């Protein structure tokens with residue numbers, strides 16, 4: 614589990630969104646595994662607006678933050694799961710790192726701010742849903 618809290622927005626994995634998230638919906642995209650809901654309190658996270666391909670992510674199944682090198686956002690095949698049919702997931706970045714299903718939502722960050730959240734895993738790989746192109750998260 615986990616979320617990004619920027620401005621009056623809460624950014625979560627679409628597959629882990631709550632009923633309250635759906636009842637306060639701002640935007641959602643199944644192809645990216647992202648959902649954004651509105652919040653009453655202002656958040657403290659800032660979004661990175663950069664070209665970094667190195668950073669640090671939080672792994673809840675180890676209670677540890679790991680440095681990683683990750684690929685640029687791309688269209689990657691994600692096999693059918695308990696949450697989606699077999700499809701291509703867009704804006705996904707891959708790295709070598711530990712992950713388990715419950716690790717989804719952990720933040721990936723660089724020196725500029727939050728880059729994305731854990732969205733896929735298994736086999737010693739971890740995939741992150743990029744949020745750096747979502748410029749509207751910085752306003753309203």
Ligand SMILES: CC(C)(C)c1ccccc1NC(=O)N1CCC[C@H](C(N)=O)C1
Nearest residue numbers: 646691694696712713714732733734735
């Ligand atoms: C062993 C699995 C379950 C693959 C796994 C292991 C470790 C971490 C996560 C996951 N889960 C996963 O990658 N899925 C299921 C949830 C939705 C994901 C998506 N964005 O389409 C794809």
Ligand SMILES: [Zn+2]
Nearest residue numbers: 663665723725
């Ligand atoms: Zn950066």
